[PDB]
Design a protein around this nucleic acid. Sequence first.
DNA 1: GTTTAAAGCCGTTTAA
DNA 2: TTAAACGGCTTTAAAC
DNA 3: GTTTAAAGCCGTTTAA
DNA 4: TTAAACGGCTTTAAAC
DNA 5: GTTTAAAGCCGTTTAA
DNA 6: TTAAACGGCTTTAAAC
DNA 7: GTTTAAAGCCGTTTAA
DNA 8: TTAAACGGCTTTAAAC
Lengths: 57, 57, 57, 57
Amino acid sequence: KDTLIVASKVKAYIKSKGFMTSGDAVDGLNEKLYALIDDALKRTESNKRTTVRPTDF
Amino acid sequence: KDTLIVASKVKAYIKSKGFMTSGDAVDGLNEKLYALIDDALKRTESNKRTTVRPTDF
Amino acid sequence: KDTLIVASKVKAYIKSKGFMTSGDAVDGLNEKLYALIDDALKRTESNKRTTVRPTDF
Amino acid sequence: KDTLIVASKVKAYIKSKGFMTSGDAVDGLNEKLYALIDDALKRTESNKRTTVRPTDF
DNA sequence: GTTTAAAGCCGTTTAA
DNA sequence: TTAAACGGCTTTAAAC
DNA sequence: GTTTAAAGCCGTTTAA
DNA sequence: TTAAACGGCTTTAAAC
DNA sequence: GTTTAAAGCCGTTTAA
DNA sequence: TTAAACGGCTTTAAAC
DNA sequence: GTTTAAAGCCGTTTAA
DNA sequence: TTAAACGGCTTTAAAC
């Protein structure tokens, strides 16, 4: 499964909050991103829609 | 706040699951991504750590 | 805000997974329950509905 | 799996926000509650701890 | 001094 | 047209 | 929380 | 031309 | 032995 | 009609 | 990823 | 009686 996140920007934002990022952290976030998207598609379908809206996530 | 998402890849993945993406869907996903990261940093800090782990998300 | 969770059953389930429950853990879970419900009501409303469905959470 | 939710209080809270509750809504919320708890126990374990904290959820 | 792991730089190449 | 990834190298830190 | 039964809504289709 | 029926769903109440 | 915090019991009372 | 909360008491464990 | 412009869909309302 | 217009939304493509 392809990375859906911009690693550099995630690391830069986390650094901005005063934290380092583990070697495998971004991979972990990517996995949570996929689950959010999959949950959203179940909500889209439940509302008899073909188009994912911000409200579905 | 910068986009943390690869828009093209998210739209392509959603399309692969048989769905269209609204004009404002990606912005909505971005907002949820930020909340997940902010939740994670509270977890990192609660564990007296300076480094975000995949388990924190 | 009232407790929406059955504390005894939460502690018993967590114990069944081989874990103890902190003095303030249940309060923390209650807070996450409220956020889930509030997110769901935003989804219900976005779908022009008056009735919360399982799919909204 | 036992209900972890106080149904009456959830229905009353949702009603307070101006919404009805579907016949199967509470069951749906229960399922999300279990996933939150299971996520938390993975976080507890990742922190080499035996006791679930509010921060783990 | 050692180990472990994370940051920071630099240059090149797709990818977005 | 532009930035993000990437992979090698060195730095840096913590703790023993 | 449960059961039982009645009300109240909504949308469609005859029936009056 | 119009309202009454109807059937599914949720609410509500009482009492244990 | 001490401290800190969590479990486990018991009995009563609403609450669900 | 039933179980969950609750508050006091003792146990238990970890680490110093 | 961005911009520009064209296609394709869907639902409603005249127009032919 | 029927289809063409129309206007919003998303997709798609090309090239930089």
